[PDB]
Design a protein around this ligand. Structure first.
Ligand SMILES: O=c1ccn([C@@H]2O[C@H](COP(=O)(O)NP(=O)(O)OP(=O)(O)O)[C@@H](O)[C@H]2O)c(=O)[nH]1
Ligand SMILES: [Br-]
Ligand SMILES: [Br-]
Ligand SMILES: [Mg+2]
Length: 319
């Protein structure tokens, strides 16, 4: 596949600039070690588990950590963290308690050290396991994801709290495209594999075909650049967000908002692969979607240009 040779070259150049460095990765691992030691001061029966992009390998540089305490202990842990020189925020008695660390004054992790600690979020640990497996299955997934996250941040469409979509939402859009849209598929659907076994956690089935050594290499040989152009075009022109649901629970990837009962927030519908009652795109407003769609079209138009050379830089320019 030489169709997108120059764009692919550019993609890997940007990828190497935005990916988390080994230095920063080690630092975050070290911060996790320190925080785990602190938790074990509170309880021998509590464990501290990393999840999210750091754990899956899908992290951009200067990333925040997402951690999870598995067993409240929340208050005791928080007060102990403060005593040990961390700065942070916590609201006691919240239905979803969260400790947000914002600074470290003693343990050398930095003035701008940022870490979110939740409690018993087992589903997030499992969806991280799923994303980790996919990143191990194909070497094109990691740079594709970083580049989509970078683009989403640069174009201001990566703000759930302000009407657009979470980074996790974008990763699911990427996986859906690579499993159920592109032909030949880049990836099989591990949840729907005949070898998958049910595994019930917090009332949902988190099972998937996880024996990766038995999964053959992809029969899709497209370049990274070809994959990304295809991804942008699908969501710009082909996907029908008014009627359709991004889903990992159908063999053909076909699911309507009607069948799902997600009609009256469901402006963009992305069904979490495990917690199927959760719409990952619940944060997306009518204005947010129009802006999201507008950016997908702009990305597609850029890459479909018949001129030479194409100014690929504009893909990651702000606004
Ligand atoms: O709807 C959601 C969102 C997030 N998560 C879980 O939280 C993890 C992180 O979600 P995330 O959207 O924050 N990804 P992140 O890499 O931190 O980028 P960003 O915050 O924009 O800088 C995800 O990888 C999931 O494990 C969910 O389980 N459900
Ligand atoms: Br993510
Ligand atoms: Br198309
Ligand atoms: Mg979560």
């Amino acid at each position: 596949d030489m169709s997108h040779k120059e764009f692919t070259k550019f993609c890997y150049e940007v990828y190497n600039e935005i990916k988390i460095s080994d230095k920063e990765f080690k630092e975050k691992r070290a911060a996790l070690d320190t925080l785990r030691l602190c938790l074990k001061r509170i309880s021998p029966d509590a464990e501290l588990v990393a999840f999210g992009s750091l754990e899956s390998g899908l992290a951009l540089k200067n990333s925040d950590m997402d951690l999870c305490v598995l067993m409240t202990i929340a208050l005791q842990f928080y007060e102990e963290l403060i005593a040990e020189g961390f700065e942070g925020k916590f609201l006691q008695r919240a239905r979803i308690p969260i400790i947000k660390l914002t600074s470290d004054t003693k343990n050398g992790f930095g003035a701008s050290f940022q870490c979110a600690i939740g409690f018993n979020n087992r589903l997030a640990i499992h969806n991280t396991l799923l994303l980790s497996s996919y990143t191990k299955l194909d070497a094109r997934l990691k740079p594709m994801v970083l580049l989509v996250k970078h683009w989403a941040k640069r174009k201001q469409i990566n703000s759930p709290y302000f009407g657009t979509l979470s980074s996790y939402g974008y990763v699911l859009m990427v996986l859906y495209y690579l499993i159920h849209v592109i032909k030949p598929p880049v990836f099989p659907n591990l949840l729907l594999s005949p070898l998958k076994q049910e595994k019930i956690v917090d009332g949902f089935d988190v099972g998937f075909d996880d024996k990766l050594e038995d999964i053959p290499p992809s029969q899709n040989y497209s370049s990274l650049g070809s994959l990304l152009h295809g991804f942008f075009r699908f969501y710009a022109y082909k996907f029908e967000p008014r009627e359709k649901v991004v889903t990992f629970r159908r063999p053909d990837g076909y699911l309507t908002k009607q069948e799902k009962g997600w009609t009256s927030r469901y402006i963009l519908a992305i069904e979490d692969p495990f917690e199927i009652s959760h719409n990952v795109g619940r944060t997306v407003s009518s204005s947010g979607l129009y802006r999201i769609r507008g950016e997908f079209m702009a990305a597609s138009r850029l890459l479909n240009s018949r001129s030479y050379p194409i100014p690929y830089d504009s893909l990651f320019e702000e606004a």
